[PDB]
Amino acid sequence: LPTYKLVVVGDGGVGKSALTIQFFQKIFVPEYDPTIEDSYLKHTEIDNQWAILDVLDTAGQEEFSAMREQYMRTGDGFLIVYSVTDKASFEHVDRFHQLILRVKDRESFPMILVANKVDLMHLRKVTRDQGKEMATKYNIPYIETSAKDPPLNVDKTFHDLVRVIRQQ
Ligand SMILES: Nc1nc2c(ncn2[C@@H]2O[C@H](COP(=O)(O)OP(=O)(O)NP(=O)(O)O)[C@@H](O)[C@H]2O)c(=O)[nH]1
Ligand SMILES: [Mg+2]
């Protein structure tokens, strides 16, 4: 019974924990801020095939973390998340991409570029074409999400990484 180790990375504040908790626990809690990384594990059915999804919500803190390096090293696919209301997080997407391809020592590896917080329409600084242009440049899928209820593409984001892994 296959296990897909997934890693969520991206700048501080982009929604990594929000997206993750929305996926597993089906909730949005504005006040929830975990300082340290959490992992999560659930059976899940993607296109009629069950899998265990084993997901790390990375915490981007400066200190060394044993768990985090394990997941980075053994991970099957990454979600690279930025926030559409934080232009810096989008500029810093290159850091993450580059980081993932070194740890893995590969030319490509299963990733999705995740443009989050698209409910905050009046604060949107990164446009849809900008994000798609950048997806294209790395040749990886682009998806827009919102962890907030009712969420958008949160389930699809996770299943789509699995899909990417599977059909690779
Ligand atoms: N409206 C809206 N708020 C969101 C969305 N995703 C996250 N937020 C909010 O934005 C803030 C930062 O969320 P958080 O999930 O902790 O970000 P993070 O990526 O885990 N940052 P860190 O690296 O510090 O853990 C929180 O207030 C959270 O409620 C979203 O899609 N829409
Ligand atoms: Mg977090």
Q: What is the full DSSP assignment across 70-88?
A: HHHHH-SEEEEEEETT-HH
Rounded Cα gap, residues 157 and 11, in angstroms: 18
Strands 77-83 and 38-46: unpaired
Closest ligand to Cα 32: 1
> In the β-sheet with 3-9, what is the strand arrangement from edge to edge?
38-46, 49-57, 3-9, 77-83, 111-116, 142-145
CA of 97 to the centre of ligand 1 (A): 21
Domain tally, the chain: 1
- Find, among 15, 4, 2, 5, the residue nearest to 116 by Cα: 15
Ramachandran quadrant class, 118 (left: phi over 0; alpha: psi -120 to 50; beta: rest): alpha
What is the domain-level CATH number for residue 33? 3.40.50.300
Structural domain harbouring 164 = 1-168
Rounded Cα gap, residues 126 and 115, in angstroms: 9
- Please, what is the Cα angle at 20 between 139 and 82, to 5 degrees? 45
Rounded Cα gap, residues 77 and 160, in angstroms: 10
Rounded Cα gap, residues 49 and 89, in angstroms: 34
CA of 131 to the centre of ligand 2 (A): 22
- Please, what is the Cα angle at 29 between 20 and 45, to 5 degrees? 35
